[PDB]
Design a protein around this ligand. Structure first.
Ligand SMILES: N[C@@H](Cc1ccc(OP(=O)(O)O)cc1)C(=O)O
Ligand SMILES: N[C@@H](Cc1ccc(OP(=O)(O)O)cc1)C(=O)O
Lengths: 203, 208
């Protein structure tokens, strides 16, 4: 049943235009961009690729899958589970060349989550992670980071230290605003600021 | 320089797709007797082919469906599924070069069956006014639950006024941003003053 997949993913794409516009033409200094939600199932992963796909039109961009717990990016580009990714780099198994997947339908570069890692937050709080991000900055104009939810784990409060912009994805049909207000509060009380929302509408 | 071209194809495709949902619903759940349905416009450039696509694709999820390209003059269907222009289709069948089996292309991403216009033919109205064209339609009726036919614009050539005799329903595709209603009212009259009746509109909105 293809036509409804076409409506869902086409809709998902337009729901990210104003966010993609702002980044491309207003805050051009925001080189590393982090997408997150308060809970699972709010459209965060498809908003991430859709954002990265459009930023790929004007800049050499990288999409990184950083939900090392339930990773989806590799799934949605039809990428191998074999394909080495982010954890592979941090663990020094493979190098960046044998890790980036190039979707040259689009020009986008994709760094998948990589093989399983039982220490996801340990890995992400690494100084091998901060070093990896610093190196990717000097190689890419834009980087888009898919993160796991803000209330499930602490990963994303950890990552936000490292990024230039946080975009908060919200299933406006179901997430309640007092929750959002609390998540915004938790970020504010450690430093990070929210630079924009994406309001998906799911059923 | 920017992503306007990328986002505008998506927005155009999304608007085009959404414009065919109510049409498809009506056919799937209200007018189930209308097995062969014809889409057309008054002029070129009104969204008619992608409306014929999405409609067929959408009917495919509930019924065994066939999309036929019958604009033998400026054909688009084959182009939009990434099918070779070589691929035999309607003209091939009418000219008896190929038979029906190694003519139909199956899009197995979607379940839809597609019959392209086929190789070029300089006798287009000649061919469609054939009897073996009607015999081809009679056979396709017994093989498909729905048949969706993309046809030429009404005011360019007369092909579609001829085709309407063979179909159970005519759907008129309209670029409501640009087509003017007295034009539409005139084309409706031309069908009204022969057999055909219009059973529904699809209102595209385009950005020339
Ligand atoms: N693609 C659909 C639904 C969707 C659901 C979940 C999803 O992934 P996650 O919840 O992990 O962000 C992505 C997309 C939409 O955005 O409308
Ligand atoms: N090519 C655009 C718009 C378009 C589509 C079909 C179309 O058909 P026609 O020119 O025959 O009316 C016209 C314009 C789209 O994919 O929606």
């Amino acid at each position: 049943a293809y036509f409804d997949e076409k409506l869902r993913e086409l809709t998902a794409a337009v729901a990210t235009i104003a966010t993609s516009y702002l980044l491309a033409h207003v805050n051009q200094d925001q080189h590393v961009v982090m997408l997150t939600s308060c809970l699972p199932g709010e459209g965060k992963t498809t908003s991430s690729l859709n954002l990265a796909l459009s930023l790929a039109q004007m800049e050499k961009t990288l999409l990184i899958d950083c939900d090392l717990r339930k990773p989806a990016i590799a799934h949605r580009f039809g990428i191998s589970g074999s394909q080495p990714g982010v954890t592979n780099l941090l663990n020094g198994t493979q190098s960046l060349e044998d890790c980036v997947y190039h979707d040259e339908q689009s020009g986008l570069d994709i760094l998948t989550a990589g093989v399983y890692a039982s220490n996801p937050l340990e890995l992400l709080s690494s100084s091998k992670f901060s070093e990896l991000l610093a190196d990717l900055r000097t190689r890419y104009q834009r980087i888009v980071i898919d993160t796991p939810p803000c209330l499930a784990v602490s990963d994303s409060f950890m990552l936000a230290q490292y990024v230039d912009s946080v975009i908060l994805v919200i299933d406006a049909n179901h997430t309640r605003t007092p929750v959002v207000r609390e998540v915004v509060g938790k970020l504010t009380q450690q430093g990070s600021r929210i630079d924009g929302v994406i309001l998906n509408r799911l059923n």
